[PDB]
Amino acid sequence: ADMEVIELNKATSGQSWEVILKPPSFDGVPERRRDPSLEEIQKKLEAAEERRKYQEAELLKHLAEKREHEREVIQKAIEENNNFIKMAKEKLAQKMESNKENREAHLAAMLERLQEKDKHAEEVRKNKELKE
Amino acid sequence: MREIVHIQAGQCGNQIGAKFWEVISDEHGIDPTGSYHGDSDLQLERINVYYNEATGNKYVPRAILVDLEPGTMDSVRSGPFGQIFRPDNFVFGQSGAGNNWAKGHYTEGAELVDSVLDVVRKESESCDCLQGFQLTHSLGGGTGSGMGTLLISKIREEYPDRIMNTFSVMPSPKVSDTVVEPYNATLSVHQLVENTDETYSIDNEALYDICFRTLKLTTPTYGDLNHLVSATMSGVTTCLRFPGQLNADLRKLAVNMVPFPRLHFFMPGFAPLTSRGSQQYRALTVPELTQQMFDSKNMMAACDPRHGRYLTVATIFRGRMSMKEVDEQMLNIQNKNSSYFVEWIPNNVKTAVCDIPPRGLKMSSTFIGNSTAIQELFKRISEQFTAMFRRKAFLHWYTGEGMDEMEFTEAESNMNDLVSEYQQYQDATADE
Amino acid sequence: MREIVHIQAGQCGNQIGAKFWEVISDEHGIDPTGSYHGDSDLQLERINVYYNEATGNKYVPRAILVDLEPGTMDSVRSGPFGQIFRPDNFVFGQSGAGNNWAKGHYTEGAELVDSVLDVVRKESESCDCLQGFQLTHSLGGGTGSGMGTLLISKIREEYPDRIMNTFSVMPSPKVSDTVVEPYNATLSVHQLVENTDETYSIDNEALYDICFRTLKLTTPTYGDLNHLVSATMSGVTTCLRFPGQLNADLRKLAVNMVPFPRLHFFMPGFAPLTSRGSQQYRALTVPELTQQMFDSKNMMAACDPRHGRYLTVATIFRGRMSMKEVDEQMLNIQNKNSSYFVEWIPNNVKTAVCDIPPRGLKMSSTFIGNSTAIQELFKRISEQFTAMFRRKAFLHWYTGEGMDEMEFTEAESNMNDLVSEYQQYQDATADE
Amino acid sequence: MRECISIHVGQAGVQIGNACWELYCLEHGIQPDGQMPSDSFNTFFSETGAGKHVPRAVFVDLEPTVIDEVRTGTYRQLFHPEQLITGKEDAANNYARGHYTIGKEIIDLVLDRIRKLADQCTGLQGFLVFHSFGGGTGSGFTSLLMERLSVDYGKKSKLEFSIYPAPQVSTAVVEPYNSILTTHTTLEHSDCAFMVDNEAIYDICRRNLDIERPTYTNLNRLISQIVSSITASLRFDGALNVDLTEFQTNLVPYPRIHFPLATYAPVISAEKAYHEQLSVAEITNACFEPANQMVKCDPRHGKYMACCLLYRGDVVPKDVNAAIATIKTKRSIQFVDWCPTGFKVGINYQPPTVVPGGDLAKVQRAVCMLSNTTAIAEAWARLDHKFDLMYAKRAFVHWYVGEGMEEGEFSEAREDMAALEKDYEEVGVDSV
Amino acid sequence: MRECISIHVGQAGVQIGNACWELYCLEHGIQPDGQMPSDDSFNTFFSETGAGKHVPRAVFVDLEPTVIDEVRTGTYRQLFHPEQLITGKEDAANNYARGHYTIGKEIIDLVLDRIRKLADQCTGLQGFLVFHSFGGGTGSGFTSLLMERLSVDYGKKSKLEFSIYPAPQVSTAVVEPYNSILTTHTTLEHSDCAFMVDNEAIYDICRRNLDIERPTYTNLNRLISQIVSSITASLRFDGALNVDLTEFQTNLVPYPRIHFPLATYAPVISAEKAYHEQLSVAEITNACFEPANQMVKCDPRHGKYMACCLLYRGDVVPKDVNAAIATIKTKRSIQFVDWCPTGFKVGINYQPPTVVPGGDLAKVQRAVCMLSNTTAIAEAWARLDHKFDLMYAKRAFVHWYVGEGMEEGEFSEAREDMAALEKDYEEVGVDSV
Ligand SMILES: CC[C@]1(O)C[C@@H]2CN(CCc3c([nH]c4ccccc34)[C@@](C(=O)OC)(c3cc4c(cc3OC)N(C)[C@H]3[C@@](O)(C(=O)OC)[C@H](OC(C)=O)[C@]5(CC)C=CCN6CC[C@]43[C@@H]65)C2)C1
Ligand SMILES: Nc1nc2c(ncn2[C@@H]2O[C@H](COP(=O)(O)OP(=O)(O)OP(=O)(O)O)[C@@H](O)[C@H]2O)c(=O)[nH]1
Ligand SMILES: Nc1nc2c(ncn2[C@@H]2O[C@H](COP(=O)(O)OP(=O)(O)OP(=O)(O)O)[C@@H](O)[C@H]2O)c(=O)[nH]1
Ligand SMILES: Nc1nc2c(ncn2[C@@H]2O[C@H](COP(=O)(O)OP(=O)(O)O)[C@@H](O)[C@H]2O)c(=O)[nH]1
Ligand SMILES: Nc1nc2c(ncn2[C@@H]2O[C@H](COP(=O)(O)OP(=O)(O)O)[C@@H](O)[C@H]2O)c(=O)[nH]1
Ligand SMILES: [Mg+2]
Ligand SMILES: [Mg+2]
C-alpha cells in the first residue's frame, strides 16, 4: 500500500495538499430548457396573485350577498307587521261600521212597527166620527 | 241606565202608585213636605233614581199622575203624602174612558196623550242620566189598559234606548169592575208583549185569594189587595234604590231576567203576607222564608210555581240577617227542587241582601221569577176573552169607537202565541 | 402582526373580558389609574399587543365594550378595573336583546352594529400592524350569541386578511334555566364555523362540573367560575403577550393549530385547578403538572380527551424550572398513549416555557388542544336543539323577529356536518 | 328605563288595581300622595317636576262611582286627574254594549290619553291590562282597547290579568257569553294572559284564611299578593331576580298557548300561627297541591310544558335546590318530552310585604308558581259548556244582537275556543 | 476583486448572521465601528469607506422587523452601513406561499436593486453566501424567490447556501416539513452548493460537550458560526484550498443535483471542566469520522463516499497530519464510489481558532473542519419526505398554502423532485456504468 501526495498549492496564510490512498476503481462515459427566464417567473407570480386576490374577493361574494340577505330578512320583519296592522285596521273599521248599519237598521224597523200604529190610530177616527 | 221617571195611569194605577210612594217614602225617610228626616246616611243612596232634587232642602218624587177622570185626581192629595208631588205633572181629564179600552187607547186618550207626552221631556231632559220609565196601570179598566199602553207605545217611539218597566195589575172576575175586562186585558197584553222591556204581572185573583184565604178576610177591600201590592213593589224596586250591585239597574235586571224578548212577564212573590195596618207578627227566619218561593200561596200572580219551570229568578232579602245562611238555605231550594229550574240557563237564580226592610216587616223575602207557569194567567184571560168573543158580545162598545174585529183577533192570536212560547221553553231540555 | 383589538359582548362576555383585563394588567404591572408599577423591564416590551400607548406615563387597553343593556355598562367601572378603558369605547345600547338570538343578530343588533363598526375602525386605524380581533361572548344569551356573531361577520367582510379569534363561552342546562339556549348556540355555532379563524370553546357544563368534588365549592355564583376562565384566558394570554417565540402570533397559532378550515374549535385545558378562596401554597410538581392537563377533569370543554384524537396540541408552561423535565414528560406521556394523537400529523404536540411565572403559586400550565372529541359538545347542543325543534317549540320568538324556519335547519345541518367532519378525521388512519 | 303601563278596565280591573297599588306602594314605603324619603321601582311609577312619584297607570270604567271611590278614598291624589277615565252609563253586563255601543264613545279618548303617558317613557316594554271576564266593560271595552292598541302600538307586549267568573260570588247569567266573546277577539292580540278564578281564590280565603263570607277587599288582598309576585322582578333587582319578559319566553312556546297557572304559598291569616315559622321544603310541594292555585283544575291529570318558580325574602339556594329534588322523586309530575329543561327558578330579595289593616299574616318566605300546564283547558271546557247550553236555545242572544252584533259572531267565537281546546289537547301528544 | 456577498434571510439567517460577523470581527481586530488596529484577504468580506471604517459586505432581510431591529440597537449597529438591513411589517407566518408568493413579492424588487448597489462596489465578485432556515415562512419562501431572481439578475454567478434543517427539539412549527420540501425543490437548480445544519445534531453536542442542558440560539449560533468561519477559511484569509467559491463545486459537487456536503467540527471544548491537555492530531482527526461531532444526523458507515476536504485552523504541520491520516485509514468502515477516488484535498490555515470572549466556547491551539459529500445525507431527506407524505395524504394545513395562491399540484411536483433526488443519491451506489 502507498500514500501518494500531489501537493495542491502554497500561500502566506495557509497551505494545502491532495492525498490519494487507493486509485479510482472506474473511468467511463458518464463517469426545452431555457432556465430560469424572468418573463416566466413574473408570469407564475402574476398568476399566483391572480388566484390569491380572487379567493379573498370570492370570499367577499359569499359575505356581501349574505349580508344583503340579513338586510332583506329584517325588511321582511317589518313589512309582514305592516301588512298585518293594515289588515287589523281593515277588519276593525269594517266590523265597527257593520255593527253601525246593523243596529241603525233595526231602529228604523222598530220605528216602522210603532209608526204603523199611528196609521191605525188615523183609520180608527176615520171609521168613527159619526153625527148620522 | 241611571234615573227612573214614574207614571201613574187610571183609578187603580193612581191608587197603587200613590200607596207605593206612601211606603217607598217612609223607607228612605221622606216626610209629606218633600224634605228628608231619616236616621242614617244609607237611605238617600243616590235618591235621584225616584226622587227629583227640588229647589232647596226638598226632594219631590219624579212621578207623572195621569187619569181621564178627576175622581182619582182629588183623592190622594187630601189623604196621606199626596201633597208631595209637583203640581204641573197632575195631568187631569174631565171626560173619561168609562172602563173601555178603545176609548182610552183611541178616542179620549188621543186628546190627553200629547199633553202628558210634553210633561215628561221636562222631567227626563232635566235628568242628568236616564234609566227609563215605570208605569203603574191596571189591565181591566179604560185609562190604565187603554191610555197607559198608548203612552207606553208613544214614549218607546220617542225614547227607544231605555227600559219600559210596568206594574200590570191585570183583572180578575173574583174582584171585577166590569164584564169587558177580558177584552181590555187581551188588547193591552198584546200592546205590553210588543212595547215593554220588562213587566211585573200583578194578578188580582192572587191578591184576592191571599186576602180571602191566607189573610182570611170575609170581604176583601181594594185597600187590602193594594197593601200587599205596594209591599211587593217596595221589595221589587229595592235593588233599583239601594247599593246592592246585583241587577240594581233597570237594564242589568232585564239582561239577567229576560232570555227571549216576548217572555218578559214576571211572577212576583212576597213573604211574609201581612194584614193591612196591623200584624204584631211571629217573624220568619232565613230557612222559614226561603222555601216560600215554591208555595203558590205567596205568589202575586195566580200561577203554581211547581206547574212550570223557572227561566230566571231574582231573590231579594230585606233586613239584618246573616247572608252566609241566607245563600246556604237559598242553595237548598235548588239542589232539592232542580226540576223547576231550567238546566240550559246556569246559575239562573240570583240572591240579594239589603239592610232596609219594608213597612212593619222586620225581615222579608221577595222572589222576582220568570216562570213558564205564567202561561196559566194568560190562558185564564184568553179563556175569559174567547167566551165573550165566540158570542161576539159587547163588541159594539169597541167597534163604535172606531175599532175593527180583526184588531181583537190579532190581540188574541199574539197572546195564545205567547202561551205556546212559554210552553215551548217549559218542554225544552238541554239534550245530553 | 404586533397589535390586537379586543371586543366584549353581552353580560357574560363583559363580565369575563373585564375579569381577563383585571388579571392581565396585574400580570404585567399596571394599576387602576393607567400608570406602570411593575418590578422588571422584560414584561414591558410586549404590552403594545393588547394595550395602547397613551398620552403620558399610562397605557389604555385596546378593548371595545359592547352590550344592548346598560346593566353591564354601569358595573365594572364602579368596581376594580373599569375606568382604565377609553370612555368612547363604551358603545352600549338601551333596549336589550332579552336572551334572543334573532333580536341580537337582527332587530336590536342592526341599530348598534354600524355604531360599534366605527369604534373598531378608529382603534385599528391607530394600529401600526394589526394581528386580528378577539371576541369574548357567550352563545346562550342574545347580545353575545346574536350581536357578537353579527360583528364577527361584519368585521370579516371589512378586514378579510386578519385572524378572527373567539372566547365562545357556550351554554349548559346545569348552570342556566333559560330554555332557548340550544337555539341561540346552534345559530351562532353555524356563524362561528364560517366566520372565525380560531375559537376557544369554553363549555359552562365543564366549569360547572368544576364545583366541589375535588374542586372545593358547593355554592357558586359566576365570578368563582369566571376565576377559572380568566385563568384559562390569562393561560393562553402568555404567547403573543410575552417575549417568548412559540405561537407568538395570531396567524402562527392558526397555521400550527388548524389543519382543516372548519375544525378550528379548541378544547382548552388548565392546571393546577385552584379555588377562588383557598390556596394550594407550596405544592405541585412537574410530572404531576404534565399528568393533569391531559385528563377530562382539567378540560374547560366537557369532552373526554380519550374519547377522540388530538389533531394539534399547544402546551404552555408558566414556571421557572428546567425546560428539560418539562419536555422530558411531554415525549413520554405521548409514547404511553400514542393512540390519542394522529399519526398523520408529525410532532403535532408543541410545548412552550415562559420565565415569569404567576404570583398566586409558582406552578402554572395551559393546554390548547384541537381534539376530535369536541364533537361531543356539539352533539349535546344538537341533541338539546332537536328536542325543542322536532315539534317547533318557542320558534315564534324567532319567526316573529323576521327569521325563517329553514334558517334553523341549515344552522342545525351545518353543525351535524361539523360533528361528522370531526369523526371523519378521528376514524382516519395514515395507512393509505 | 323599561317602563310598564298598567291599564285597569271595569269594576274588577279598577278594584283589583287599587288593592295592588296599595301593596305596590307598601313594597317601597310610599305615602298616599307619593312621599318616600331616603331606584328600581321607577319602571312601574314615573316622577314629576315637583319631586313626587306619579303613576304610569290608567283606570277606565263606563260607570263613574267605582273610579270615584278611589279618587275620594284613602289613596287620594297620588295620581293626577287625566288617567282616571269615566263614562256615564255602564255596559250593563253585555259584551256588545261595552265593545260596540257605550265603549265606542270613550275609545278614542282613552287612545288619546294612552300616548300622553307612553310618550313620557324612555322605552316601554308593553302593557298590563287588568279586567273581568263576565263584566260588560271587562269583556267588551278591554277587547276593543286590546284590538285598537295592536294598531296604535303594533307588536308591543300585552300581558293581561283576566278574572274568571265564579257562580258563588256576585255575577250575571250572561257571564260565559261575555267570557267566550272577549277571549276570541283577544287571542291574536295579548302576548300573555294570567287567569284568576274567583271560585279558586274564594275557596282559599275561606279554607286557609277562615273568612266564611269574604268581600272583594279580602278577595283582592290575595290577588294583589300574586300580581305583586308576578311583577316585583321588574320593580326590584336582587342577586338573580329573573325578569318576567325573560321567562314569558320560557312559558309561551306557541302564540295561542299563553295561559299560565298562578299558585301561591304560604296562605296564613293574621290570627294564630306565630310559631312553626314555615320550612323551605313545605311551600315548594304546596305549589303542586291543587288547593293553593288561582285556577280550578287538576295539574296531576295534565302535562307540564313550563314551570316557573318565583320566591320572596328569606330563601337560600341549597334548600330550594333540595326542595325541587323532593318533588322530582316523591312526586309523579308528568313533564312533556319536548322541553327538559324543567323549572325556571327565581329568588327575590324583598321580604313578603302584607297590608297592616288587612287579614293575611307577615311571613319570612313566600313562593309563587307560573307553569304552563295542559290542565288550564279544563277551565275553558267549563266556560264553553255553559255557553253551548245557553246558545243552543239562543238565551239572552237578543241583548247582544240588539247592540248591533251578528249571530255568526257567537259561532265564530265558539269555533276559536273549539280550536284552542284542540290546541291544548294537541300539545300533550308526544312525538315518536 | 474576489469578494463574497453574504445574504441573510429569515429569523435564523439574521440571528446566525449576527454570530458569523462577530467571529469575523475578533479574528481581524475590527472593533464594532469598523476601525482596525493595523492579511490582504480580509477585503473579500469588508469594504473600506471614505471615513475609514470597514463595512461588511452583507445584506439582512426579514419580512418581520424586531429581529433586524435587534442588530440596529445592538453594539454592531455602526458596523453595518445604516440602510443595509431590509425589513417588512408582517412576517410570513411559517408559510412558504406567504414568504414566496405574497408578502415576499412586495420586498423582492427592493432587495435585488439593493444587492445591485453593494455588488457594484466589487471589481470581480465571486458569488453569494445565502443564510436561511428550512422551516420558517421567510428563509424557506423568500430565499427560494431571492435565489431564482439572483440566477436571472446575476446569471452564471456561483451561489452557495447555509440551510438550517428543522429539529422537533427547538421552537418549530407543525408545517416545517412542508416549507422544507417546497423550498429545496424550487432552490435546487439556483444553488451551486448547499451546507445543511441540523438543529437536532447541534443540540445533541452542547449538553454532551459544552455542558449546557437547555441552550438558547445565542449558544446554538455560537457553534454554527465556528463551522461557517471554518468553511470560509481561505475566503476570509489567503489560503490554498477553497480560495474562491467555485472551488467548492469542483472539489465537492459532482452533479448539479448532488450538492449537499456534510459538515463536522472538532474539538468541541467548554470552559467549565477544569484544564485538560492540548490534544492535537490522531485524536481530533478521527473525531471527524465519529458521527457524534457532525452537523447533520447521518451515519456514513453505509453511505458510499465521493470526496473529502479536511480543513484545519491553527498551528498544524503536514507531517503529523498525514501521520494522523495513516492511523485512521488502517481498518475503517469508509468506502468511496467506483469512479471518484479516495482523494481528500487536505488544507491547513496557520490562523488560531478564534472564540467569543463573552461566550461559552474555550480557546484551543488547533481546530479541524471536514467537508464530505456522502450518500448518507439522503437519510435526512428521507426523514423530511415521510413527514411531508404523512400530512399531505390527508391534505393537513394545505389550505393555508392554497389560500396564498399556491396550486395543489405544486406540492406533488415538489415531492416528485425529492422522490427523484432520493433516487439520484441511491443510484450512485452501484458498480458502475
Ligand atoms: C347563575 C349561575 C349559578 O352559578 C348557577 C345556579 C344559579 N346561581 C345562584 C345559586 C342558585 C342555584 N339554584 C338557585 C335557585 C334560586 C336562587 C339561586 C340559585 C344553584 C345553586 O344551588 O348553587 C349551589 C344551582 C342551580 C341548578 C343546579 C345546581 C345548582 O347548584 C350549583 N342544577 C344543576 C340545575 C338543574 O336545572 C339541573 O339540571 O340539575 C339536574 C336543577 O334541576 C333539577 C333539580 O332537576 C335545579 C336545582 C338542582 C333545579 C331547577 C332548575 N335550576 C337551574 C339550574 C339548576 C337548578 C346555582 C348561580
Ligand atoms: N276578584 C274580583 N272580582 C270582581 C271584582 N268586581 C267584580 N268582580 C267579578 O267580575 C265579574 C263582574 O264583572 P264587573 O267587573 O263587576 O262588570 P264591569 O267590568 O264593571 O262591566 P259593566 O259593570 O257591565 O259595565 C263577576 O265574576 C264578579 O264577581 C273585584 O273587585 N274583584
Ligand atoms: N440555529 C438556529 N435556528 C433557528 C434560529 N431561528 C430560528 N431557527 C430555527 O429555524 C426554524 C424556524 O424558521 P424561522 O427562521 O424562525 O422563521 P422565519 O425565517 O423568520 O420566517 P417567518 O417568521 O415565518 O416570517 C426552526 O427550526 C427554528 O428552531 C436561529 O437563530 N438559529
Ligand atoms: N188591586 C187593585 N185592583 C184594582 C183597583 N181598581 C181597579 N182594579 C182592577 O183593575 C180593573 C179596573 O181598572 P181601573 O184602573 O180601576 O179603571 P181605569 O181608571 O179606567 O184605568 C178591574 O179589574 C179591577 O178589579 C185597585 O184600586 N186595586
Ligand atoms: N361562565 C359564565 N357564564 C355566564 C355568565 N353570564 C352569563 N353566562 C351564561 O351565558 C348565557 C347567557 O349569556 P348572556 O351574556 O348573559 O346574555 P347576553 O347579555 O344577551 O349576551 C347562559 O348560558 C349563562 O349561563 C358569566 O358571567 N360567566
Ligand atoms: Mg261594573
Ligand atoms: Mg422569524
Q: Is the dihedral of CA B18, B22, B27, B32 positive or negative?
A: positive
Which atom of ligand 3 lies at the shortest distance from residue E170's CA? Answer: 29
- State whether residue B205 is helix, strand or coil: helix
| Cβ proximity of E345 and A8 under 8 Å | yes
Residue of C179, C184, C388, C397 for testing the chain D interface, max D β-carbons within 10 Å: C179
Q: CATH number of the domain at B1-259, out of 3.40.50.300, 3.40.50.1440, 3.40.50.720, 3.40.190.10?
A: 3.40.50.1440
**D144 sits in which H/E element:** helix D136-152
Superfamily, domain C374-432: Helix hairpin bin (1.10.287.600)
Superfamily, domain C260-373: Tubulin/FtsZ, C-terminal domain (3.30.1330.20)
Cell digits for E315? 498551528
Which atom of ligand 2 lies at the shortest distance from residue D196's CA? Answer: 1
Distance, in angstroms, between C399 CA and closest chain E CA? 37
Which atom of ligand 4 lies at the shortest distance from residue B104's CA? Answer: 20
Rounded Cα distance between C93 and C71, Å, is 10
Selection from B418, B396, B421 nearest residue B183 by Cα: B396
* Residue that the C-alpha cell 452537523 belongs to: E295
Selection from B284, B268, B266, B267 nearest residue B357 by Cα: B284
Tallying the residues shown for chain E, one arrives at: 433
Cα B29 to the chain's mean position, in Å?
23
CA distances from D284 to B128, D206, D321, D375 (A): 56, 22, 10, 19
What is the architecture, at CATH level 2, of domain D376-432? Orthogonal Bundle (1.10)
The residues, any chain, with a CB within 8 Å of residue E163's CB and separated by 6 or more, are E132, E133, E134, E194, E195, E196, E197
**D44 sits in which H/E element:** none
- Burial code (b: 16+ CB inside 10 Å, e: under 16) for E323-334 equals ebbeebbeeeeb
CATH of the domain spanning E377-433: 1.10.287.600
| Cβ proximity of B410 and A116 under 8 Å | no
| Cβ proximity of D111 and D148 under 8 Å | yes
Selection from D182, D173, D165 nearest residue D96 by Cα: D182
The resolution, in Å, is 3.5
Q: Tell me whether chains B and C touch (3+ CB pairs under 8 A).
A: no
Residue type, E421: L
| Cβ proximity of B204 and B175 under 8 Å | yes
The residues, any chain, with a CB within 8 Å of residue D101's CB and separated by 6 or more, are D91, D94, D403, D404
Name E354's bridge partners: none
**CA-atom Rg of chain C in angstroms:** 21
E401 a known binding residue? no
- State whether residue D373 is helix, strand or coil: strand
Residue type, E165: Y
No. of helices (H) and no. of strands (E), chain B: 13, 11
| Cβ proximity of D416 and D183 under 8 Å | yes
D342 pocket-lining for ligand 1 (C-beta < 6 Å):
yes
Rounded Cα distance between B7 and B63, Å, is 6
Neighbors of chain C by Cβ distance (3+ pairs < 8 Å): A, D, E
Cell digits for C56? 403620558
Domain ranges of chain E: 1-261, 262-376, 377-433
Rounded Cα distance between D249 and C98, Å, is 9
C308 pocket-lining for ligand 1 (C-beta < 6 Å):
no
Contacts of D406 in chain A (CB under 8 A): 98-99, 102
Cell digits for C400? 316573529
Cα E425 to the chain's mean position, in Å?
20
Quick one: closest CA in C to D252, which residue? Answer: C394
CB contact under 8 A, A76 and C402: yes
CATH of the domain spanning E1-261: 3.40.50.1440
Selection from B35, B36, B21, B40 nearest residue B320 by Cα: B40
Could you check whether the bond before residue E177 is cis, i.e. omega within 30 degrees of 0? Answer: no
Q: Cα dihedral angle (E199, E204, E209, E210), rounded to 10 degrees?
A: 50
* Residue that the C-alpha cell 344569551 belongs to: C141
| Cβ proximity of C362 and C319 under 8 Å | yes
- State whether residue B350 is helix, strand or coil: strand
- Residue from the list E102, E340, E344 with its beta carbon closest to the beta carbon of A19: E344
- State whether residue C369 is helix, strand or coil: strand
Separation of E97 CA from ligand 7 center, angstroms? 15
Name C369's bridge partners: C267, C313
DSSP strand pairing (B310-318 vs B364-371): antiparallel
E376 HSE (CA, 13 A, CB side): 24
Residue type, E1: M
Q: Is the dihedral of CA E215, E216, E222, E225 positive or negative?
A: positive
- Burial code (b: 16+ CB inside 10 Å, e: under 16) for B271-293 equals bbebebeeeeeeebebeebbbbb
Phi, then psi, of B30 in degrees rounded to 5: -120, 125
| Cβ proximity of C12 and C138 under 8 Å | yes
The residues, any chain, with a CB within 8 Å of residue E400's CB and separated by 6 or more, are C255, E95, E97, E175
Name C134's bridge partners: C6, C165
Selection from D248, D93, D65 nearest residue D178 by Cα: D93
Rounded Cα distance between C181 and C232, Å, is 24
Rounded Cα distance between C286 and C299, Å, is 19
Domain ranges of chain C: 1-259, 260-373, 374-432
The residues, any chain, with a CB within 8 Å of residue E430's CB and separated by 6 or more, are none
Gaps in chain A following residue numbers (C to N > 2.5 A)? 31
| Cβ proximity of A89 and D152 under 8 Å | no
Selection from B426, B425, B414, B424 nearest residue B381 by Cα: B414
Cell digits for B286? 232565613
CB contact under 8 A, E39 and A27: no
DSSP characters for B83-141? GGS-STT-B--SS---S-HHIIIIIHHHHHHHHHTTTSTTTSTT-SS--EEEEEEESSS
| Cβ proximity of B5 and B124 under 8 Å | yes
Quick one: closest CA in D to A96, which residue? Answer: D100
Rounded Cα distance between D254 and C397, Å, is 9
CA distances from C371 to A31, C222, D60 (A): 54, 27, 65
**C405 sits in which H/E element:** helix C405-426
* Residue that the C-alpha cell 209637583 belongs to: B86
Rounded Cα distance between C337 and C334, Å, is 5
- State whether residue B344 is helix, strand or coil: coil
Q: Could you confirm whether E70 is annotated as catalytic?
A: no
- Residue A72's Cβ-count burial label (10 Å; 0-12, 13-18, 19+) is exposed
| Cβ proximity of B204 and B195 under 8 Å | no
| Cβ proximity of C188 and C101 under 8 Å | yes
- State whether residue D192 is helix, strand or coil: strand
Contacts of B414 in chain A (CB under 8 A): none
- State whether residue C413 is helix, strand or coil: helix
Separation of D216 CA from ligand 2 center, angstroms? 10
- Residue from the list A107, A110, A128 with its beta carbon closest to the beta carbon of B402: A128
Cell digits for D397? 242572544
The residues, any chain, with a CB within 8 Å of residue B421's CB and separated by 6 or more, are B260, B262, B263
**Helix runs in B29-63, H state only:** none
CB contact under 8 A, D249 and C180: yes
CA distances from C282 to B56, C274, C279, C320, C361 (A): 100, 13, 9, 14, 7
- State whether residue B271 is helix, strand or coil: strand
**CA-atom Rg of chain A in angstroms:** 57
**E346 sits in which H/E element:** strand E343-349
Phi, then psi, of B163 in degrees rounded to 5: -90, 130
Q: Does domain D261-375 have CATH number 3.40.30.10?
A: no
* Residue E172 falls in which region: left (phi positive, over 0), alpha (psi -120 to 50) or beta: left
Cell digits for D330? 316523591
Ligand 3 site residues, Cβ closer than 6 angstroms: E 10-12, 15-16, 62-64, 91-94, 99, 133, 135-139, 164, 166-167, 170-172, 199, 217, 220-221, 224
Cell digits for C87? 370612555
**DSSP designation for D105:** H
What is the architecture, at CATH level 2, of domain D1-260? 3-Layer(aba) Sandwich (3.40)
| Cβ proximity of E139 and E58 under 8 Å | no
| Cβ proximity of D127 and D9 under 8 Å | no
Q: How many CB atoms lie within 10 A of CB D325?
A: 11
Neighbors of chain D by Cβ distance (3+ pairs < 8 Å): A, B, C
Selection from E137, E186, E176, E193 nearest residue E414 by Cα: E186
Among residues E200, E247, E404, E427, the one annotated as catalytic is: E247
CATH of the domain spanning E262-376: 3.30.1330.20
Residue type, E276: H
Residue type, E392: Y
Rounded Cα distance between B97 and E12, Å, is 134
CA distances from E232 to E118, E242, E323 (A): 20, 8, 26
Residue of E95, E133, E174 for testing the chain C interface, max C β-carbons within 10 Å: E174
CA distances from B54 to B32, B64, B86 (A): 14, 16, 10
Cell digits for B34? 218633600
Chain A residues with CB-CB distance to B under 8 A?
A: 107, 110-111, 113-115, 117, 120-121, 123-129
Strands (E), E222-336: 262-266, 305-314
Rounded Cα distance between B388 and B178, Å, is 13
Rounded Cα distance between D176 and B264, Å, is 22
Task: Give the closest residue (by CA) to ligand 5 atom 4.
Answer: C12
Cell digits for D147? 284590538
The residues, any chain, with a CB within 8 Å of residue C18's CB and separated by 6 or more, are C8, C65, C76, C79, C81, C82
What is the architecture, at CATH level 2, of domain A32-132? Helix non-globular (6.10)
| Cβ proximity of B327 and B228 under 8 Å | no
Q: Which residues of B are annotated as a binding site for GTP?
A: 11-12, 97-99, 138, 142-144, 181, 204, 222, 226
The residues, any chain, with a CB within 8 Å of residue D198's CB and separated by 6 or more, are D163, D164, D165, D166, D168, D169, D219
**DSSP designation for C9:** E
- Burial code (b: 16+ CB inside 10 Å, e: under 16) for C131-152 equals bbbbbbbbbbbbbbbbbbbbbb
Phi, then psi, of B170 in degrees rounded to 5: -70, 155
Rounded Cα distance between B97 and B150, Å, is 13
| Cβ proximity of B80 and B24 under 8 Å | no
Rounded Cα distance between E23 and E29, Å, is 10
Q: In what order do the strands lie in the sheet with D126-132?
A: D84-86, D57-61, D4-9, D126-132, D157-164, D192-197
